Design a protein around this ligand. Structure first.
Ligand SMILES: [Br-]
Length: 271
């Protein structure tokens, strides 16, 4: 049934595809030690630099020991080869129910009581990562990497291994839907506040049911609006005055003017 193994043989690869990217292919896995299914994701190694390659060798060990209700479990990482393609396999907790992006497409408008519930859980996980020693910065938090455990269940934060491959200082092709980014990401100088900006945009997408800066055609058009202080058109479509007020304080142009995770958890909306 398998088409791969984890060298030590703790988990094996199957020929069942779930997700796809420009560098990633997600297949089903199975832990032999705990008899539980996992996510086998191959990452083409040839595309990765030596500077980012040695990071994976060090970051993975730290990600292994992390345990949190709102964090997708990281198990192992190693370099792999199939036929003539070099790759790196990330093995993580399997998420079958999907993401927030698929939920927002499936159910259009999201309810207020479930929005409060999930956003709090995102902040619970974000606080966890920042309170680690040394602190962990997500860098690339978006709606399609916040995974649901069920249709009613809690949310978990994923793509932690993929986070170091965000490549903000890198030039990428103009294809598909352009991704928004924090003002200080383009300069590689960032901290905890970069995840707050990402959260504010995530809550915006959860409330308005649409992708921010959709009026723009390319990423450069988004850059001009983000760096100058021009907010997305969807921001005005927020019905709830309280939710809009929280978003506004998270998507500030200056990183020093943004709310802290502590402030958002202590906020009246999140009880
Ligand atoms: Br990952």
């Amino acid at each position: 049934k398998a088409v791969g193994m984890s060298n030590d043989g703790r988990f094996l690869k199957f020929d069942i595809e779930i997700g796809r990217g420009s560098f990633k292919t997600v297949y089903k896995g199975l832990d032999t030690e705990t008899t539980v299914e996992v996510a086998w994701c191959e990452l083409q190694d040839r595309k990765l630099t030596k500077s980012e390659r040695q990071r994976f060798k060090e970051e993975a060990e730290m990600l292994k020991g992390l345990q949190h209700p709102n964090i997708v479990r990281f198990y192992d990482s190693w370099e792999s080869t199939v036929k003539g393609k070099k790759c790196i396999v990330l093995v993580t907790e399997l998420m079958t129910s999907g993401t927030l992006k698929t939920y927002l497409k499936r159910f259009k408008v999201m309810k207020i009581k479930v929005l409060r519930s999930w956003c709090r859980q995102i902040l619970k996980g974000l606080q966890f990562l920042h309170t680690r020693t040394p602190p962990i910065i997500h860098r690339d938090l978006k709606c399609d990497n916040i995974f649901i455990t069920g249709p009613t269940g809690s949310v978990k934060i994923g793509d932690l291994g993929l986070a170091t491959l965000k490549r903000a200082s890198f030039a990428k092709a103009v294809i598909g839907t352009p991704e928004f980014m924090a003002p200080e990401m383009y300069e590689e100088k960032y901290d905890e506040s970069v995840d707050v900006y990402a959260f504010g945009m995530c809550m915006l997408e959860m409330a308005t049911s649409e992708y921010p800066y959709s009026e723009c055609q390319n990423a450069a058009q988004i850059y001009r609006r983000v760096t100058s202080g021009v907010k997305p058109a969807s921001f005005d479509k927020v019905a709830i005055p309280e939710v809009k007020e929280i978003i506004e304080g998270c998507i500030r142009q200056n990183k020093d003017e943004r709310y802290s995770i502590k402030d958002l958890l202590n906020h009246a909306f999140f009880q």
